[PDB]
RNA sequence: AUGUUUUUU
C-alpha cells in the first residue's frame, strides 16, 4: 500500500477495484478522491497505510508531503508531519521522510504520520549525524562531465561544440546567454540527453518556471529524469515556493554525497517573480528592480557549489538578453560577473538557420586546465586562435563542415596539426 | 420565440407587428423596448418564450446572458441566471445556455431561467462530465492551416508569401509586429479571409480593442465570422470585460474539442487597459509599466495552446512598435521572448508602396518540419538561403516579380532549381 | 514625487 503506486495506476482500473471494494460510484469521482476512499476502506480493514514525499515545513511549525508528479502543489492527499516529530528528529525543508500513514479521522483533512521507516532514502541513524551544506568546503570543477555521445550521431554535434567550446564539470556555476528565438529549447533538450545518456548515474533535475505548458509536457516525456516545471498561469508565489523546494532537496542531496544537476531556464523569470513578490520599499532602482529583488536569485545561483567531502551541485541557468524590457538587461549582467561560465549564442547565425548557433568567440570556462589534459587544453587553444580572426558565422561554418567529417574530435585535432 | 430572431428582424416589421398586437405607440420606442412589449404580450397569451447567450458569472453568484450583437455589453434583456441552477449544473462563464425564459414579473428587472435544453450546443449530459481547459495535455502545431487560396487571384500573393514566410498551424501562438502605417489592417482582412475560404470549419473570433467605429464596421461587414470589438470611447473596464469574455468562451469551446482562432489586434491596447485598470502599487518600472500590469495579457498569450485529446486555439495578436512611447516597446516587447512566431513588417517598405511589406529575413516558425514535408523544408530553406543576402526591399521586389509569373509556390520552387 | 521611466555612447 503506496502512494505513488495508486497514483501510477491508471484511472479505469482504480475504478474497477472501487467498485469492488463496495464504495459509492466512482465514475462521477475524482482519481485523487478515489484513491482517498480506497485508502480509508483498505484501512477500515486494519492494515497499513505506507506514503512518501518531500516534506516542506511551514512558518508554524507543522509541514506537509509534497509529491514530485503535481509539481509540489498543495494536494488533499498530503501527510500531515507534526511539530513534535519534526523536533524528535530535527526534520528541515527537503528531508525524504517514508513511513506508515493512516487516513484523517473525524475531524481531520490529511493523513497522519505514525513511524518514519527510511530519511532521505538512507537510515534515520545516518541522516542524524550530518554536516549541514552551510558548512561543506567549495571547490572548483574537478571530475569532467563529458558532454560528447560518441555514437556518431548527427545530432552529437552540438554536444561536440559545446565541448570544444565550454566543457562542463561537476559543481559548475555558468549561464547559457541567448536572445529570445535562438535555440535554447533545442540545444537543452540536447543537453538533457547528454546528461542522462553519458552520467545515468547523477540526479537530473529540469526547473522550468513561467513557461508555455505545451513545452512542459513536452520535457516532460522527452527527458529521461525529473521535471519539476510551473506554468505561467500559477502566480509568482508558487514560482517561489517550487523554487525553495527544488534547492532545498537539492541541498539535502548534497548533503548525502550525491551529484544534483540543476538545469535552469528562467533565471530572468524567477528574479521577476522575486521582484513581483517582494513588499514595496518606495526605492526604485533603474529599470524596475528593487534593491532587495536580486538577493534571493543571487543565492539560488550562488547555492552550486563542488563538495570536497562528497557530492556537487551543478546549476546551469539560461538568461534571456534583448527582450526589450530593461529589466532583464539589469538583470542578465548583475548576474553576468557571476556563472563561472558563459555560453552566447547568436541570433545572426540563427536567422540564418545555422544550427546551433553558438557565440563560439565570446564562450570560454575558467580553470579549464582542472578539467582537460595538456595536450587536449594546448589544441583548443590552437583551435581558438584559428577561429578568432575569422567571423562568427564563417566560424561555425567552418568548424561544422570539419566536424562533419569525422566522428570524433580527437581526428580533427589530430587532421589540424 | 428566438430573442436573436427578434434582434435580426427590422424595425419596421417589428413596429408593424406591435401595433397589431394592440400596445402603445411602437413609433417613438427603442427596438429593445419593442422587443420586450413583444415578449410580454405574448407570453400574457400562455405561449413559452426561448433565448440564447454566453454566461457571466458574477462576483455575488449571480449572473446574465450577454449577447454578441452587442459586444458582450450590458443590456436590459440579459437573461438573470440564478446561483441555485449554477449550483445545480456547475456552469461557469463562458458555457453557452439555451432554455425557456419568462418576463420580469412585479419587481424584477430581467428574464429568468426556467429549464436549460441545451449547454455549448450539446446535450447537458455530455458537459457535466467534461475534462477542464487547465488540464489538457499541451502540445506543438501538427495540423497544418494552409492559407493559400489557390484560386490564382492577385490578392492570393501575400497569402503565398506569409506560407512561405511562417507557415501557421493549429495550436499557433505568434506575433504579428509592425510599426503603425505599415498595412496592418489589410493584412488582417486577407488572413481573415483566406481562414475564412480555406478552413471554413474553424471558429473565428476577430477582437478588436481600442479601435475606431469605422473600422469595426469595416471589418464586421467584411469577414465571415464572428466581430466582437471595443471602440475607443468605452473605459478599459469594458475591454477587460470583453477580452476575459471571449478568452472564456475560447477555453469552454475548446474543452468540446472545437478548433478555436483568435485574430488579435490589439494586444499592445490590452496590455495598456490592463495598466490602467490595475490598482497603483507605489512602484513604477521603466516606461510607466506596473510589475503586476502584464500578468493578465501575459496569462490571456499563453492561453493558445494545442489539445492532444482534441481540439485547438491560435491566437495571433498584432504587436505595435516605434509608436514614440517607452511602455509599448516595453508591453510590445517583455511579450517578444514569449511566442513563438514573429512576422516583421518593415515601415521603409511600405513607404516605396511594396506591398506586402513583409521582413522576410526576421521571419520564421519555430519547429516548422512538423508543418511541412522534407522536400518542401529543403525548398523553403534554399530560398531563405538564396534571398539572405540581397537586401530587403531588393529581396521582395524578386519574390514579388517570381510570384507574378505562376499562380502556385511549388512551379516556382520547381523553376529555381 | 527621489530611484525606475525619460536615457544614449
Ligand atoms: N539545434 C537546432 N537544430 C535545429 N533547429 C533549432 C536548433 N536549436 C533551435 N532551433 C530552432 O529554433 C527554434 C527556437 O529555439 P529555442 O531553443 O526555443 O530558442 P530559445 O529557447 O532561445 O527561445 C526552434 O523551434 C528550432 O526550430
Ligand atoms: N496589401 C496591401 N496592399 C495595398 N495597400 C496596403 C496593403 N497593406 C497596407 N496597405 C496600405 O497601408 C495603409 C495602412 O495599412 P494598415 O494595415 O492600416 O497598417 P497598420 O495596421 O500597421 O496601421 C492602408 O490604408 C493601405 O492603403
Ligand atoms: F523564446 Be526563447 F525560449 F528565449
Ligand atoms: F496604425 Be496601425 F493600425 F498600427
Ligand atoms: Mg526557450
Ligand atoms: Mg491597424
Given at each position: ?6 497514483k ?20 462521477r469521482?475524482?482519481k ?26 511551514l512558518?508554524?511549525?507543522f509541514?506537509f508531503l ?6 509540489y ?10 511539530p ?18 493512516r ?15 527510511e ?5 534515520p541513524?545516518?541522516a542524524?549525524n550530518?554536516?549541514?551544506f552551510?558548512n561543506?568546503?567549495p571547490?572548483?570543477?574537478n ?6 555521445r560518441?555514437n ?7 554536444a ?8 562542463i564539470?561537476?559543481?559548475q ?11 535554447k529549447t533545442m ?11 553519458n552520467?545515468?548515474?547523477?540526479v537530473?533535475?529540469?526547473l ?13 516525456r ?7 516545471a510551473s506554468?505561467?498561469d500559477?502566480?509568482a508565489?508558487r514560482?517561489?515556493q517550487?523554487?525553495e ?12 554525497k ?7 531556464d528562467?533565471?530572468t ?9 517582494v513588499?514595496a520599499?518606495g ?6 528592480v528593487?534593491?532587495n529583488?536580486?538577493?534571493?536569485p ?7 557549489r563542488?563538495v ?16 526589450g524590457?530593461k529589466?532583464?538587461?539589469?538583470i542578465?549582467?548583475?548576474?553576468k ?13 540563427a536567422?540564418?538557420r545555422?544550427?546551433p ?7 570560454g570556462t575558467?580553470?579549464?586546465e582542472?578539467?582537460?589534459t ?9 583551435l581558438?586562435?584559428?577561429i ?30
Amino acid at each position: 500500500m503506496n502512494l505513488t503506486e495508486l497514483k501510477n495506476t491508471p484511472v479505469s482500473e482504480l475504478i474497477t477495484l472501487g467498485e469492488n471494494m463496495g464504495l459509492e460510484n466512482l465514475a462521477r469521482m475524482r482519481k485523487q478522491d478515489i484513491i482517498f476512499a480506497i485508502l480509508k476502506q483498505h484501512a477500515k480493514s486494519g492494515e497499513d497505510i505506507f506514503g512518501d514525499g518531500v516534506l516542506e515545513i511551514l512558518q508554524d511549525g507543522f509541514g506537509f508531503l509534497r509529491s514530485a508528479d503535481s509539481s509540489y502543489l498543495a494536494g488533499p492527499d498530503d501527510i500531515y508531519v507534526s511539530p513534535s516529530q519534526i523536533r524528535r528528529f530535527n526534520l528541515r525543508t527537503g528531508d525524504t521522510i517514508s513511513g506508515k500513514i493512516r487516513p484523517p479521522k473525524e475531524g481531520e483533512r490529511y493523513f497522519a504520520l505514525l513511524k518514519v521507516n527510511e530519511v532521505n532514502f538512507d537510515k534515520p541513524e545516518n541522516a542524524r549525524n550530518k554536516i549541514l551544506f552551510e558548512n561543506l568546503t567549495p571547490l572548483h570543477a574537478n571530475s569532467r562531465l563529458r558532454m560528447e555521445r560518441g555514437n556518431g550521431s548527427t545530432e552529437d554535434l552540438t554536444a561536440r561544440v559545446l565541448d570544444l567550446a565550454s566543457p562542463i564539470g561537476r559543481g559548475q556555476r555558468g549561464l547559457i546567454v541567448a536572445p529570445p528565438k535562438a535555440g535554447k529549447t533545442m540545444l537543452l533538450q540536447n543537453i538533457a540527453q547528454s546528461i542522462a545518456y553519458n552520467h545515468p548515474d547523477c540526479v537530473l533535475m529540469v526547473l522550468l518556471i513561467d513557461e508555455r505548458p505545451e513545452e512542459v509536457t513536452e520535457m516532460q516525456r522527452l527527458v529521461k529524469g525529473e521535471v519539476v516545471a510551473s506554468t505561467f498561469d500559477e502566480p509568482a508565489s508558487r514560482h517561489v515556493q517550487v523554487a525553495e523546494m527544488v534547492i532545498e532537496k537539492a541541498k539535502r542531496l548534497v548533503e548525502h554525497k550525491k551529484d544534483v544537476i540543476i538545469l535552469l531556464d528562467s533565471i530572468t523569470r524567477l528574479a521577476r517573480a522575486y521582484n513581483t513578490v517582494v513588499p514595496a520599499s518606495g526605492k526604485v532602482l533603474t529599470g524596475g528592480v528593487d534593491a532587495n529583488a536580486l538577493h534571493r536569485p543571487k543565492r539560488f545561483f550562488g547555492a552550486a557549489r563542488n563538495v570536497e567531502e562528497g557530492g556537487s551541485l551543478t546549476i546551469i541557468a539560461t538568461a534571456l538578453i534583448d527582450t526589450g524590457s530593461k529589466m532583464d538587461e539589469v538583470i542578465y549582467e548583475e548576474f553576468k560577473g557571476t556563472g563561472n561560465m558563459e555560453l552566447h549564442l547568436s541570433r545572426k547565425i540563427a536567422e540564418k538557420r545555422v544550427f546551433p548557433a553558438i557565440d563560439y568567440n565570446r564562450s570560454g570556462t575558467r580553470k579549464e586546465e582542472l578539467l582537460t589534459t595538456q595536450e587536449e587544453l594546448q589544441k583548443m587553444w590552437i583551435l581558438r586562435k584559428i577561429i578568432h580572426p575569422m567571423g562568427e558565422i564563417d566560424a561555425m561554418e567552418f568548424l561544422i563542415n570539419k566536424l562533419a567529417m569525422t566522428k570524433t574530435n580527437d581526428d580533427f585535432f589530430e587532421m589540424m596539426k
